[PDB]
Design a protein around this ligand. Structure first.
Ligand SMILES: [Cl-]
Ligand SMILES: [Cl-]
Ligand SMILES: [Cl-]
Ligand SMILES: [Mg+2]
Ligand SMILES: [Mg+2]
Ligand SMILES: [Mg+2]
Lengths: 213, 200, 202
């Protein structure tokens, strides 16, 4: 949380477009400069060479009680962030949802938990991030509790509307109220680093490069 | 102990671990082997379990064509029970894949051979003076899931499923139903149907 | 113990040897060399070189790393911060560093893959070392998975993982490992032309 109360904050398309050229590392270093951890440890890229940027649409699961359906609600440009207590014994994403995502402008799926139909996901080149791969259905194993509620994954809060950026290094949560400022800082981090890389690739010591830049 | 009909094996060749698991669920059976991951991207196998039990301190000549070797090494990470020699043997003798409760070596060879290997991970220390073959063609227990010699193994990118041989026809039939239904749902989704519309 | 240099021709001969062969050779001397859980992060890569060790501790050095080194970085197996990323990858490519082995995690995996740099670690993450972990010392002994790694040891890593070869035994282990592969080649060729495994062993 922040020094100001939480408020749903729209994020300009331009800020999202900029994230096309930003790595999770830059965004994480920017967040760190604001005193905030953003990484979701253990939530790994499952499809080589993929990445996504979009607005968190949150999904929270709970134990079966009763005594995929939510996906029709998810806006174009969303990254779905699903929390199932880090469970490895059932999956909360598969082929139907993947095909749906691809047909409905959904950018990627981040899972505190596991997914199935990995071959379809790979074949579709869909940006899936999860704690792993399994095949057993959610049916009679876990059930939807609520969507568009705050999630807490490894102590990191994800609010509906937060900026999600994911790549080969994993997933970063950027609070919506800070998104423009974090993206600005991340761009500056990338610029400084590019000069450092250019320097060491021209025979500078790292020592030299780091304090000329 | 029961052979499986060839037509059941043939149908299964176009089924997924998800379809088979959903079918098993409908019969009240868990099929999945948690933690036993695909080690070779893009591979799959369907075949008959030939079982191998190791114990703390070869058999391959006995393995029938069309077998999927399922080897239990108590989930150990300090030694391996599959490597290059066995991969090359499998490929020359119609062996369809290997599933290991434990780890495998010569991962680079397995990948280059496109061999369907499924394991708890990758390592290089040899079984020799670490683990020894105890028995073959005995029932195995992996993550509480029993595997009998003869059971139908189906393995892909999502992991490995054990289908009890005595029920294989019913499971495969149900699994085909699950798959046919989903194909229709996916078709409708691609033409722009809502998920609710598609499930109606 | 003694610091033991290793001839370039031994390194060159080791260039194509699989980690399985080196482990089998080590076993013949009664030595465990494998680092379980330290997994290849860049499909199809491998490295051979001399361990330059780096120890981190809870809350730079790379200019001191000789060409031909494999950097072995110990970070208590931590998953919350990374000790390798894009700057260091481009440094290694410009300075003849052969690969990096991490007891912990690395970032900028997409750059590392694109540079085809041989990286081995317990995984992938993006959070910086800054204000999370700090350099303790270099060229000190490390302990990873109960295996002691001395600066100067021969490191060999591939798809199957990472092997530590004690420098005093390195030349012997490489020669034995070559023998292992030659023996196995004859077996594989017998198998591939239709021999039983039994016949192929003899
Ligand atoms: Cl699905
Ligand atoms: Cl072997
Ligand atoms: Cl770096
Ligand atoms: Mg399906
Ligand atoms: Mg960077
Ligand atoms: Mg070999």
């Amino acid at each position: 949380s922040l020094s100001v109360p939480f408020e749903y904050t729209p994020i300009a398309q331009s800020v999202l477009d900029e994230c096309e050229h930003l790595d999770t590392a830059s965004l994480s270093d920017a967040l760190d400069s604001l005193g905030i951890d953003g990484g979701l440890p253990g939530i790994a890229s499952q499809v080589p060479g993929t990445r996504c940027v979009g607005i968190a649409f949150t999904v929270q699961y709970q134990p079966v009680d009763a005594s995929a359906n939510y996906i029709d609600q998810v806006p174009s440009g969303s990254v779905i962030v699903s929390s199932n207590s880090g469970r490895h014994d059932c999956t909360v994403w598969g082929d139907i949802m993947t095909h749906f995502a691809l047909a409905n402008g959904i950018k990627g799926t981040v899972i505190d938990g596991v997914a199935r139909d990995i071959d379809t996901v790979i074949n579709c080149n869909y940006p899936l991030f999860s704690r792993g791969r399994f095949m057993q259905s959610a049916k009679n194993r876990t059930q939807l509790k609520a969507v568009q509620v705050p999630l807490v994954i490894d102590g990191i809060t994800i609010q509906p509307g937060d900026l999600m950026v994911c790549d080969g290094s994993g997933c970063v949560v950027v609070p919506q109220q800070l998104a423009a400022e974090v993206v600005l800082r991340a761009r500056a981090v990338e610029q400084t680093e590019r000069r450092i890389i250019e320097a060491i690739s021209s025979g500078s010591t790292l020592e030299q490069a780091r304090m000329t830049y």
